[PDB]
Design a protein around this ligand. Sequence first.
Ligand SMILES: CC(=O)N1c2ccccc2C[C@@H]1C(=O)N1CCC[C@H](C(N)=O)C1
Ligand SMILES: [Zn+2]
Length: 140
Amino acid sequence: SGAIYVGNYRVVNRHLATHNDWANLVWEDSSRDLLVSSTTAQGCDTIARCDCQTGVYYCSSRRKHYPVSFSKPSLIFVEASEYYPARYQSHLMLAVGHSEPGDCGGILRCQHGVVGIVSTGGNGLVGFADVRDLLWLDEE
Ligand SMILES: CC(=O)N1c2ccccc2C[C@@H]1C(=O)N1CCC[C@H](C(N)=O)C1
Ligand SMILES: [Zn+2]
């Protein structure tokens, strides 16, 4: 579990969004596993606007932050789960690292701010949903 809090927006994994997130929906994309809802209180996270390929992510199943190298956001096949059928997820970045069910939502950060959140895992790989292209998160 986990979310990004920037301005009056809350960014969560779409498959973990609550019924209340849907009532307060701003934008969602099933193909990216992302959902953004509106908030009343202003948040303090800064979104990275860069092409960094190295950063640090939080792994809740280890209670540890790990430094990683990660691939550029791309269209990657994700096996069927209880949340989605087998499909290509877009804007996904992979790193060699640990992730297990329950780790989604952990933040991936570089020197510029938040890059994305954990969205996939298994087989010694961890996948992050990129948020750096969502320029509108920085306004209104
Ligand atoms: C590490 C982790 O999150 N997982 C994992 C790991 C090891 C074995 C199985 C899993 C399931 C789960 C995972 O990858 N997803 C289930 C939730 C939705 C995700 C998506 N973006 O489509 C896919
Ligand atoms: Zn960066």
